[PDB]
Amino acid sequence: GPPTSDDIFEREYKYGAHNYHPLPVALERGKGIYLWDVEGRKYFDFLSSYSAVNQGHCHPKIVNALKSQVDKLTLTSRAFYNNVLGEYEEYITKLFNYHKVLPMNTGVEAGETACKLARKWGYTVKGIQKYKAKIVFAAGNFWGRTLSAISSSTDPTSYDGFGPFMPGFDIIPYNDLPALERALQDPNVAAFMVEPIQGEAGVVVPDPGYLMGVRELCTRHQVLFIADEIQTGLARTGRWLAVDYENVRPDIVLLGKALSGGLYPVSAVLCDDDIMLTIKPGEHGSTYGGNPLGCRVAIAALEVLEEENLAENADKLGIILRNELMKLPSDVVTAVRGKGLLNAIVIKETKDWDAWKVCLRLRDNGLLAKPTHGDIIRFAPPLVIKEDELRESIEIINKTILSF
Amino acid sequence: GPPTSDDIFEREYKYGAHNYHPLPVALERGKGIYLWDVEGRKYFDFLSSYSAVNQGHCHPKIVNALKSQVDKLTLTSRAFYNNVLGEYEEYITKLFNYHKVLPMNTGVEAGETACKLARKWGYTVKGIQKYKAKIVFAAGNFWGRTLSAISSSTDPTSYDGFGPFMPGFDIIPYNDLPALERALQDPNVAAFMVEPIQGEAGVVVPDPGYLMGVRELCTRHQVLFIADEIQTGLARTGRWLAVDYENVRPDIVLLGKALSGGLYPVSAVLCDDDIMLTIKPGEHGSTYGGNPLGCRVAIAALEVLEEENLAENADKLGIILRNELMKLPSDVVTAVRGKGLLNAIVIKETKDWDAWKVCLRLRDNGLLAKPTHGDIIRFAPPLVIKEDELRESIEIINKTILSF
Numbered sequence: 098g099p100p101t102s103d104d105i106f107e108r109e110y111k112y113g114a115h116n117y118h119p120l121p122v123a124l125e126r127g128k129g130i131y132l133w134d135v136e137g138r139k140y141f142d143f144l145s146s147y148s149a150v151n152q153g154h155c156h157p158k159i160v161n162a163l164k165s166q167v168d169k170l171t172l173t174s175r176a177f178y179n180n181v182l183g184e185y186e187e188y189i190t191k192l193f194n195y196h197k198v199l200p201m202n203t204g205v206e207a208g209e210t211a212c213k214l215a216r217k218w219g220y221t222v223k224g225i226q227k228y229k230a231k232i233v234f235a236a237g238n239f240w241g242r243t244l245s246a247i248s249s250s251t252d253p254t255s256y257d258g259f260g261p262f263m264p265g266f267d268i269i270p271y272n273d274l275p276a277l278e279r280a281l282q283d284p285n286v287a288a289f290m291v292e293p294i295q296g297e298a299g300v301v302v303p304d305p306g307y308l309m310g311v312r313e314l315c316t317r318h319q320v321l322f323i324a325d326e327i328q329t330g331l332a333r334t335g336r337w338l339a340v341d342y343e344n345v346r347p348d349i350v351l352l353g354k355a356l357s358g359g360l361y362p363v364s365a366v367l368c369d370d371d372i373m374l375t376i377k378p379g380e381h382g383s384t385y386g387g388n389p390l391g392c393r394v395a396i397a398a399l400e401v402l403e404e405e406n407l408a409e410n411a412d413k414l415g416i417i418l419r420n421e422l423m424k425l426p427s428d429v430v431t432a433v434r435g436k437g438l439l440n441a442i443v444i445k446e447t448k449d450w451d452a453w454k455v456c457l458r459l460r461d462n463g464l465l466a467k468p469t470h471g472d473i474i475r476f477a478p479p480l481v482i483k484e485d486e487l488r489e490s491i492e493i494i495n496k497t498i499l500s501f
Numbered sequence: 502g503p504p505t506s507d508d509i510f511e512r513e514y515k516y517g518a519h520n521y522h523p524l525p526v527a528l529e530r531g532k533g534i535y536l537w538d539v540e541g542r543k544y545f546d547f548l549s550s551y552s553a554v555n556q557g558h559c560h561p562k563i564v565n566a567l568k569s570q571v572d573k574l575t576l577t578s579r580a581f582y583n584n585v586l587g588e589y590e591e592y593i594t595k596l597f598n599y600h601k602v603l604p605m606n607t608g609v610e611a612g613e614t615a616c617k618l619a620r621k622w623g624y625t626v627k628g629i630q631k632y633k634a635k636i637v638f639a640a641g642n643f644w645g646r647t648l649s650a651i652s653s654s655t656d657p658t659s660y661d662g663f664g665p666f667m668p669g670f671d672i673i674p675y676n677d678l679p680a681l682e683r684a685l686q687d688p689n690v691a692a693f694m695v696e697p698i699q700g701e702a703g704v705v706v707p708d709p710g711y712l713m714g715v716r717e718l719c720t721r722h723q724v725l726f727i728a729d730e731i732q733t734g735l736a737r738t739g740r741w742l743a744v745d746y747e748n749v750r751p752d753i754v755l756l757g758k759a760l761s762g763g764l765y766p767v768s769a770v771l772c773d774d775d776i777m778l779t780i781k782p783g784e785h786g787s788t789y790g791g792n793p794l795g796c797r798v799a800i801a802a803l804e805v806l807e808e809e810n811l812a813e814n815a816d817k818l819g820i821i822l823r824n825e826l827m828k829l830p831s832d833v834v835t836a837v838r839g840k841g842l843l844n845a846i847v848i849k850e851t852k853d854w855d856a857w858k859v860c861l862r863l864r865d866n867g868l869l870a871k872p873t874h875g876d877i878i879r880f881a882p883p884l885v886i887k888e889d890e891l892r893e894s895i896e897i898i899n900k901t902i903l904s905f
């Protein structure tokens with residue numbers, strides 16, 4: 098088949114579902130912070146696969162871990178034991194400090210597991226009457242595309258037309274303690290699920306003290322605090338978990354994306370015994386969850402973040418990026434925000450230009466990024482980037498923004 | 502890290518969730534139809550990872566496909582195009598004869614997507630009033646562990662304790678045309694989802710003509726026929742799809758498990774334009790869905806089934822297996838059933854023995870299998886198995902069954 102970008106677009110339009118509207122670029126190779134298309138052109142990756150490639154594309158140490166296990170064993174299922182799962186479980190639990198881990202594959206799967214864990218704990222420990230348990234969510238949230246995940250969404254694009262919704266899901270505003278407090282008055286609430294920073298909403302960072310307040314309010318009302326760190330976790334914001342900035346310990350933590358460096362779908366639910374053990378043998382599972390292959394790549398992927406001090410780099414580099422982005426004109430950039438290497442700028446949609454246009458020109462100029470709402474562009478380059486490369490990227494951003 | 506089977510069991514009991522009760526065997530290597538534990542012992546694999554390794558463990562052609570792509574590109578996300586997704590889409594659609602494919606990762610994800618596709622089609626094409634769409638399922642069904650999947654389950658173990666359930670899900674008996682006809686009288690039904698052969702239920706094969714009747718009933722009442730071939734498809738039963746035995750063409754087909762030969766979580770939803778295009782850009786997705794790496798292994802995994810005539814081998818060998826299991830005494834074994842290489846025997850649970858005990862001794866004798874209900878043992882060996890090896894396996898089964 099088709100070796101031209103236009104041929105690649107055409108073949109997908111014909112044989113694939115139209116559930117996505119991609120930026121017209123056809124990539125075939127990626128290494129570190131770089132991506133090359135079919136026409137041989139080189140691009141700075143400022144999307145990182147939505148934070149799934151924190152360690153850069155095809156990181157050698159992660160790649161070798163995959164190559165080393167494929168020849169040995171890749172899948173036995175959890176009906177038998179393999180030698181790799183135990184190692185990964187011991188490593189991840191001690192690294193984050195929780196008794197146990199429940200392994201799954203994709204991000205939503207981790208979110209569903211946490212909801213099942215919260216409901217089961219709600220009924221068996223808190224003593225909520227059977228099928229009256231509620232889980233509170235914050236407006237702007239994103240945790241996946243299952244029927245359950247779109248039922249807590251405030252985005253019409255996600256739920257409109259998707260049959261009847263999952264009951265028991267409440268929604269309150271984000272970054273609002275009084276709202277939370279009011280909602281937790283209902284003794285039927287089992288958990289509150291939140292993102293320490295809302296990514297898909299447009300990198301909305303809550304006020305300092307928000308996570309501390311949530312922790313206090315949840316502890317006080319005997320409600321589980323579930324932190325979704327699938328996008329904000331793993332060094333992306335400057336810490337192992339974004340929650341670390343306020344020294345807060347959630348009851349359940351969700352990890353996904355970058356947990357495999359982009360080489361395999363691996364996700365995890367971390368929590369202590371009193372919550373985790375409410376699920377008995379045969380009550381929950383997944384065919385590929387906890388397979389030998391994904392466990393090997395996750396160990397290596399976690400090691401790369403540690404050995405290379407990627408959080409520290411993200412933290413230091415994040416400051417420079419943001420500082421430089423605040424110099425741009427206000428008639429184009431109304432806001433700059435973020436933490437570590439998860440940032441965003443807000444474009445002033447006028448009748449001549451918008452975020453999609455800015456992204457296309459940014460592409461023409463060598464940098465890949467995608468808008469999140471038509472006026473919000475997110476910048477999230479692999480954490481392995483160096484200051485010189487970042488400096489180079491910023492020049493492209495300045496050049497592009499100012500050329501309008 | 503613990504090198505003993507008992508050390509491996511203990512480590513997992515300590516750091517991992519107790520959602521599974523595995524057969525006490527610790528595997529570390531697998532090749533074709535064989536599995537070796539940590540003590541170096543060899544076993545015939547008669548579970549195949551629940552039909553995920555039809556092509557045998559670590560098939561060289563699939564493994565090389567993975568090794569070849571890891572060095573190039575593994576994940577860009579669907580915010581940009583890659584060069585591999587279009588190829589896989591063109592290949593899979595033409596192979597099964599549907600206009601398009603929507604790529605996902607796990608089996609449940611494919612099932613959720615189909616439910617979303619059915620609800621959207623129900624409202625936009627069939628004209629059902631917003632949020633009145635229903636999907637009918639069959640008792641005994643299994644399509645995953647998300648909150649939505651356990652909502653159509655008739656298995657208490659799957660749903661008990663899991664908060665309130667997803668509305669709009671009706672359940673009728675399996676292998677019952679009159680029940681289906683009665684259910685489809687309701688103009689608010691959008692789809693009927695069924696397994697051609699119910700695997701987890703204990704390999705329950707419906708009567709000849711059942712799939713033809715479902716097709717006629719669905720077509721007549723303008724209801725989508727969704728066939729879940731995640732376990733029965735891909736040569737396992739003797740045909741590309743189990744539905745092929747009756748020459749039936751479902752509206753939506755779900756593939757998973759063996760679509761990657763056990764090397765990566767890849768699943769697919771196949772259907773024509775009139776159903777697929779009800780989902781617009783931005784209305785559905787997955788981070789890892791349709792990634793370059795999984796697409797490469799799926800193409801190779803599909804090619805292996807073709808080039809090696811595994812369907813024909815599964816068909817021919819299934820007859821021998823079943824014939825031999827039928828020579829079994831009638832006081833120990835009650836039933837023998839199946840199609841191709843998806844089979845099961847029903848054990849008479851007496852106060853002295855059961856299916857779990859039979860599997861433990863089967864393990865002691867060199868063969869791995871797991872019971873599905875305490876009196877049902879499923880036999881599903883990789884499709885690459887040869888007659889001599891099957892003959893050898895049968896001797897172990899005879900030896901074991903008769904030693905009680």
Ligand SMILES: *Cc1c(COP(=O)(O)O)cnc(C)c1O
Nearest residue numbers: 203204205240241327328787788
């Ligand atoms: C990516 C994401 C998810 C959804 O995960 P998938 O692997 O796409 O299912 C969940 N939560 C957050 C906050 C995410 O960014």
Ligand SMILES: *Cc1c(COP(=O)(O)O)cnc(C)c1O
Nearest residue numbers: 383384607608609644645731732
């Ligand atoms: C395995 C299976 C699934 C569930 O798939 P996962 O990959 O485990 O999510 C769905 N349907 C059927 C019939 C299956 O056998």
